[PDB]
Nucleic acid binder design. Structure first.
Ligand SMILES: *CC[C@H](OP(*)(=O)O)[C@H](O)COP(=O)(O)O
Ligand SMILES: [Mg+2]
Length: 324
DNA sequence: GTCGG
DNA sequence: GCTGATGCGCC
DNA sequence: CCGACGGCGCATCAGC
């Protein structure tokens, strides 16, 4: 795209701040500045020009000015040549290894995947799985597979109980050619916010999907949400499919469609819809949609039976998952 | 790092 | 054995 | 000039 050099620089600076410096806000800033520049329909000639965009401040401008003039950034070259920084930045790619564990490993002389395999005793359950499917988790999922994966989930959910309502959200629901992982939202007439659940409602779906050898491993499981690994059935004639990340979140029926809206995305869209709601005098979150009183106090949660209901409440024209 | 009170 | 703090991850 | 910038489910560990 236009200004591929500047965006890469910023995204590289962002990763450094998150993984090495452990400054989450600086990371979010550099990410913000990188995204707005990526959409920009020109080629930035000066830092003063880039500063006119929202999220680009004084310091990023003086960075853009340096990059365009010199070709490479003085700071990043210092980070690139640093053994500790680059090593810490690598390990954080492994699922279960955040900045904290990463630094702890590199300080103890563990820098590469070879070292992680050699020292599996020092890894937790999550990190072991993160290492096992390291390459597989960095592969994107083509829509062709996601469709085949969906059919298995929805049918196997139907196999346990007909009353279950399974909805695959994320990029896939917006109709993207490729998706990062599978994000499934589950609910049942039995489960609501007021009247609590008898457990083994999510479990039965997870236990069923394991029975048909779809779910391979488990990263985390509890009452509400589950996180683990799944694999499509080997065609036998062809080579086996790569392992994929799956998430199954069990949500109360009354606040399902409020959940479906939030987990459908995108971030920019939710941020714009939530911003408009405040202008119209309503407050929406992951869970519920509520009215803001005269004094600016949230009332009782309003009834919702679809996504349309939320769009109606804030007198907004219904947008299809394609245009999110 | 950038924004807004 | 319990309860709170903290790392990690989602968009 | 200075505080906000994501609140939460689950796994793990510290402290009692
Ligand atoms: C690149 C500009 C940085 O500003 P921030 O608000 O993190 C630094 O202040 C410049 O110093 P460097 O990081 O040592 O180059
Ligand atoms: Mg600006």
């Amino acid at each position: 795209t236009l200004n591929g050099g500047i965006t890469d620089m910023l995204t590289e600076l962002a990763n450094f701040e998150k993984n090495v410096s452990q400054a989450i806000h600086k990371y979010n800033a550099y990410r913000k500045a990188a995204s707005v520049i990526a959409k920009y329909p020109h080629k930035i000639k000066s830092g003063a020009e880039a500063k006119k965009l929202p999220g680009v401040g004084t310091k990023i401008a003086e960075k853009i000015d340096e990059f365009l003039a010199t070709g490479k950034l003085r700071k990043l070259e210092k980070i690139r040549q640093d053994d500790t920084s680059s090593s810490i930045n690598f390990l954080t790619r492994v699922s279960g290894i955040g900045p904290s564990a990463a630094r702890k490993f590199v300080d103890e002389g563990i820098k590469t995947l070879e070292d992680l395999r050699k020292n599996e005793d020092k890894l937790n359950h999550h990190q072991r799985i993160g290492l096992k499917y390291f390459g597989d988790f960095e592969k994107r999922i083509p829509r062709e597979e996601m469709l085949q994966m969906q059919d298995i989930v929805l049918n196997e959910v139907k196999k346990v109980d007909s009353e279950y309502i399974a909805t695959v959200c994320g990029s896939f629901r917006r109709g993207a050619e490729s998706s990062g992982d599978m994000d499934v939202l589950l609910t049942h007439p039995s489960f609501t916010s007021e009247s609590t659940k008898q457990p083994k409602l999510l479990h039965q779906v997870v236990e069923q999907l394991q029975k048909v050898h779809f779910i391979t491993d488990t990263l985390s499981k509890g009452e509400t949400k589950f996180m683990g690994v799944c694999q499509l059935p080997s065609k036998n004639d062809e080579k086996e499919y790569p392992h994929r990340r799956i998430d199954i979140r069990l949500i109360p029926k009354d606040q399902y469609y409020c959940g479906v809206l939030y987990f459908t995305g995108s971030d920019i869209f939710n941020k714009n819809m939530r911003a408009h709601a405040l202008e119209k005098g309503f407050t929406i979150n992951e869970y519920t949609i509520r009215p803001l009183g005269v004094t600016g106090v949230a009332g009782e949660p309003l009834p919702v039976d679809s996504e349309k209901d939320i769009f109606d409440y804030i007198q907004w024209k219904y947008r299809e998952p394609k245009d999110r």
